[PDB]
Paper text:
A recombinant supply of protein supported high‐resolution crystallographic and biophysical studies with ligands (AMP and AMP+d‐Ala‐d‐Ala), and comparisons with orthologues enzymes suggest a ligand‐induced conformational change occurring that might be relevant to the catalytic cycle.
Burkholderia pseudomallei is a serious, difficult to treat Gram‐negative pathogen and an increase in the occurrence of drug‐resistant strains has been detected. We have directed efforts to identify and to evaluate potential drug targets relevant to treatment of infection by B. pseudomallei. We have selected and characterised the essential enzyme d‐alanine‐d‐alanine ligase (BpDdl), required for the ATP‐assisted biosynthesis of a peptidoglycan precursor. In a similar manner to that observed previously in other studies, we note a paucity of hits that are worth follow‐up and then in combination with a computational analysis of the active site, we conclude that this ligase represents a difficult target for drug discovery.
Author numbering: 3 to 312
The structure:
Amino acid sequence: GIDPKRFGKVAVLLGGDSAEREVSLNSGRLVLQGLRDAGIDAHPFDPAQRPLAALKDEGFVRAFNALHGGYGENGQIQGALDFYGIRYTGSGVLGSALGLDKFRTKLVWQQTGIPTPPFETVMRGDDYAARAQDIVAKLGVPLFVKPASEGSSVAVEKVKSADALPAALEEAAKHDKIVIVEKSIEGGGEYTACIAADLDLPLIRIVPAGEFYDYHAKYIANDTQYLIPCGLDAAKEAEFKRIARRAFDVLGCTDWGRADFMLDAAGNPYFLEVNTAPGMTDHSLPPKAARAVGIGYSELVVKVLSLTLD
Ligand SMILES: Nc1ncnc2c1ncn2[C@@H]1O[C@H](COP(=O)(O)O)[C@@H](O)[C@H]1O
Ligand SMILES: [Mg+2]
């Protein structure tokens, strides 16, 4: 119950130049309506088409970031907004940049007791056959080969056989100077924990129809399931929500986003990444998690924006 005047003049950052301009336009237009439904003085601002300095010059005090990919997510616009004195939703420079770097995220997690798949690295110019032998010996198969980060050119690959690993390594190393090779977490399920301020949001179980939550399962298929309830017992659900929040916090992220994790057959969790720029379309996961606990869309957006006060 915040007087919408306390928010002042608000920009919704949407659109941009990235390959995810269209999810951002969709999300941002809805966010904008959510804020205006609450009587907040909100206005769209597409940084690809307006000069960024206009945020300061036109007197905007804060921004709801609905950008996705590139400068909108990686710390670059975060830094510029801090430089221009504009408060914004989501994580600051370090958290944003670190969240997109799966290598350094996993190092920090390993040092701070956040569970994450065992992994090795391969560098461009390595003896890929030699590295493959050593990695299989340590981790077995299957393996996930992914950018250290991140997703730029070469899609995540599940390697099922030792003899296929050298080629997968060489190809991944052509498009990132650091490649992560993780043990495949098998025999459980896949989950995500949405984080929004102190809201108690339920876990979601992600059930791809195919091998893993690949591009096809995310963007092509209409049959990926996003399940609430997630199927876990109350104690485990509480435990994993707590670890998810610590996993975000230790990276310097602040509490808007999602933490993604796998369970093995024994029910142990292994975190894969954080996402500091989740979607806000009417089919996106944070609005679903919020609606499951009685929080509607406009309420959710207002709550996220409230974290920029004080
Ligand atoms: N180590 C892993 N074990 C099991 N599944 C994984 C692992 N890494 C990635 N995946 C799957 O691949 C998808 C995309 O990987 P990523 O973008 O790195 O999270 C994940 O959402 C999971 O479905
Ligand atoms: Mg993304």
